[PDB]
Design a protein around this ligand. Structure first.
Ligand code: HEM
Ligand SMILES: C[As](C)(=O)[O-]
Length: 446
């Protein structure tokens, strides 16, 4: 059996390629050949913490030009991963979320207010871009108490523009990288040098201004803990350069993932009417009336069905489509087949595993009730790890799940969603999975 696969979208191409194999195979996608694992029994062996661990994959290695040794792009051996991980964990717990809840909810209010004017003017809204401006402000204001953009305004901050140009310059493949960019001083290399200094200077200013602020009577946020808490083992705090890396990390690793997940959930809510009705009924019962909901921290986790909507969105389209693992020792997965020497790395294809046949014959359908604890217990071997696995799983899972529910609850409570007729779901692949050309229109529910 011969197959022609288009790897223009890499992860979507690997998933189609994986259906002619038995859960593991090889494939050349771009600058490398990768062992792709998309089988339920094989993946859970790869997710074993005693034998395997996180591998800084190719793209993650290329993001080190932007985020350096931040928690997302640092190697396991680098002392700055363990220090930061044991320092920032208390800043991402459920307890720490209640400290941010007010600022998160206030930032959602700012977006809803801006979307009121667009609903009044009967305007089509580019959903991924708007949701990406929101999650940026959510992380920056709740985490660092810093504001980059006003959501009612459409001028873009120079800092966030430089970070995006710096992300594009990092992913540049070795063939598109000129052999002598380090020497000619072209416009692109010079723009990167200027952008890098401008980004480092802005995060240093955020660090210096806070250092002058004693923050009397206020609970410490993410920036405060990085300037206050020392690592219990080594006794040292995160140095200035690493703190600037964590700020850049939380900005890029937290914004795009959460924004595209919200954009996917908005699409499926605007397309399947029964789900939109059941979710809109759950948020109407929690906050009666059409006044903006008085969000209190405990009410967010009580929205069971809206949580099932986000879970099904993260299953059908995991914005983080996969992760790279490496072998801590010489081991074998499966049944003794497939041997791996220490430091050999594979790719866990979550998009293929989440849509795998083990999720039932209706794995391609958006059905939130599937993600209940009882409905999933009736499945057996199946993978659902949208936030990774192990000690290097997503530190911001509780943060993302909190902001994704408040954002969706406010939108469903205040607006109704009109999809674009004739449009069909196309998913582009950047650092994350994103709905391309997704446009919705809103009317105030009155
Ligand atoms: C829908 C939302 C999100 C999804 C699906 C997601 C997904 C993931 C995944 C799959 C990983 C593991 C990467 C790997 O194994 O190579 C990860 C790690 C990480 N995430 Fe996210 N994430 C989300 C939101 C956030 C947010 C809001 C933050 C805020 C700070 C964040 C910060 C991080 C960090 C720092 C790591 C690295 C942790 C470590 O390696 O020690 N993420 N995330
Ligand atoms: C380079 As490593 C083994 O610390 O991911």
């Amino acid at each position: 059996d011969l197959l022609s696969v288009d790897f223009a979208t890499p992860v979507q191409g690997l998933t189609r390629e994986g259906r002619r194999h038995d859960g593991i195979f090889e494939q050349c996608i771009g600058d490398f050949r990768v062992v792709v694992v998309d089988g339920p029994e094989l993946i859970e062996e790869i997710n074993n913490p005693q034998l395997w661990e996180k591998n800084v994959g190719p793209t993650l290695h290329k993001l080190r030009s932007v985020a350096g040794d931040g928690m997302f792009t640092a190697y396991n051996s680098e002392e700055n991963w363990r220090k930061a991980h044991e320092i920032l964990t208390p800043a991402f717990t459920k307890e720490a979320m209640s400290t941010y809840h007010q600022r998160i909810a206030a930032t959602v209010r700012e977006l809803i207010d801006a979307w009121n004017t667009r609903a009044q003017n009967n305007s089509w809204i580019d959903i991924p871009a708007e949701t990406n401006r929101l999650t940026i402000e959510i992380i920056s204001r709740a985490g660092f108490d810093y504001q980059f953009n006003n959501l009612a305004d459409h001028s873009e901050n120079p800092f966030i523009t430089a970070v995006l140009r710096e992300l594009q310059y990092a992913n540049r493949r070795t063939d598109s990288i000129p052999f002598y960019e380090q020497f000619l001083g072209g416009r692109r290399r010079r723009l990167h040098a200027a952008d890098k200094k401008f980004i480092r200077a802005e995060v240093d200013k955020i660090i210096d201004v806070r250092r002058i602020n004693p923050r009397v009577g206020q609970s410490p946020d993410m920036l405060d803990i990085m300037l206050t808490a020392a690592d219990p083992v080594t006794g040292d705090k995160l140095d200035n350069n690493n703190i600037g890396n964590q700020i850049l990390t939380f900005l890029v690793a937290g914004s795009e993932t959460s924004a595209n997940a919200i954009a996917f959930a908005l699409h499926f809510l605007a397309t399947t009417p029964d789900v939109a009705a059941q979710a809109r009924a759950e948020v109407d019962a929690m906050w009666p009336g059409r006044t903006f909901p008085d969000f209190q921290f405990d009410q967010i986790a009580k929205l069971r069905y809206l949580r099932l909507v986000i879970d099904e969105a993260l299953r059908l389209w995991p914005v983080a489509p996969g992760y790279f693992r490496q072998a801590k020792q010489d081991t074998t997965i499966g049944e003794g087949r497939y041997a791996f020497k220490k430091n050999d790395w594979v790719f866990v294809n979550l998009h293929a595993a989440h849509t795998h046949r083990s999720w039932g014959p209706d794995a391609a359908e958006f059905k939130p009730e599937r993600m209940s604890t009882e409905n999933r217990r009736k499945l057996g071997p199946h993978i659902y790890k949208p936030f990774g696995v192990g000690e290097r799983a997503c530190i911001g899972r509780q943060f993302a799940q909190h902001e994704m529910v408040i954002a969706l609850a406010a939108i469903l409570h205040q607006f109704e969603l009109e999809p674009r007729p004739g449009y069909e779901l196309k998913v582009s692949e950047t650092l994350t999975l994103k709905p391309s050309d997704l446009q919705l229109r809103l009317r105030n529910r009155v």
